[PDB]
């Protein structure tokens, strides 16, 4: 019984390493939806926004919402309290302070951005002095996000069979943002889980501890 989680740098967004590509959007290049300030729930969840529909995010200059708009959910890291537990064999893990509805952002899986060759050079690394350090989750071809050095709470997410969430990549100031939105409803107190099929199958001395009836019994 560890009472600590392994060190790590608690950040707010991605950081790039090394050589890996980052995109970035001036005001004038990010979509424009045609919500209006005095909609029911302007650029949110249950509305017709543009923007929404097509998984990219409003910012605060261009959207014609204004401040109303409900379609910021990653800039202002809107995420559903959370608390850090201690399960058997899974280890850490995270589960919510309120009920989560269907279709509902929880998180935003952040970290330390690197290209292929860096994330293969470190699992190969990792599988050689035997390092459980899978915090790897791929944007696309040659850009991964490392959460192991520095992440947020993300990076306590454990993997489900039968997962609650699953990640959606999302278009954020000119680049591709990755979130964690909910599959189901989910009452406050039950683990937060999404499902991990975005590496190899470097599965050694780890094996599916899911617990779900459907576990085909691995991680890749
Ligand atoms: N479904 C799972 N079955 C067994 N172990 C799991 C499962 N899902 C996540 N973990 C743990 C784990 C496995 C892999 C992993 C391995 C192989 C894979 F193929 C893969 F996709 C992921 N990467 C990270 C973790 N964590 C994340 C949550 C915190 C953690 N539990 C922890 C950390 C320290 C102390 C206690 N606990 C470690
Ligand atoms: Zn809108
Ligand atoms: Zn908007
Ligand atoms: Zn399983």
């Given at each position: ?31 424009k ?8 729930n ?15 995010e409003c910012?605060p ?16 890291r ?21 009920d989560?509805?269907?279709g ?13 060759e ?41 993997h ?12 954020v100031?000119?680049d591709?943002?990755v ?10 107190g039950?683990?937060?889980?999404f ?6 199958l ?5 094996v ?13």
């Open positions: 019984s560890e009472r600590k989680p392994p060190p790590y740098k608690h950040i707010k967004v991605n950081k790039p390493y090394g050589k890996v590509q980052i995109y970035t959007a001036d005001i004038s290049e990010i979509p939806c045609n919500c209006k300030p005095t909609d029911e302007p650029c949110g969840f249950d509305s017709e926004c543009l923007n929404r529909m097509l998984m990219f910012h200059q261009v959207c014609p919402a204004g401040e109303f708009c409900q379609n910021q959910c990653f800039t202002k809107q995420y559903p309290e959370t608390k850090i537990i201690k399960t058997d064999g899974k280890g850490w893990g995270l589960v919510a302070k309120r989560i509805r269907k509902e952002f929880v998180n935003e899986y952040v970290g330390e951005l690197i290209d292929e860096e994330c293969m050079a470190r699992i190969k690394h990792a599988h050689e002095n035997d390092i459980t350090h899978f915090y790897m989750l791929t944007i696309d071809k040659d850009r991964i996000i490392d959460a192991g050095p520095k992440g947020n709470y993300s990076r306590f997410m454990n489900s069979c039968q997962p609650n969430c699953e990640t959606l990549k999302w278009t100031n000119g591709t943002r979130g964690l939105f909910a599959v189901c409803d989910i009452p406050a039950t683990e937060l889980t499902n991990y099929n975005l590496d190899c470097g599965n050694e001395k780890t599916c501890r899911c617990g779900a009836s459907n576990c085909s019994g691995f991680l890749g």
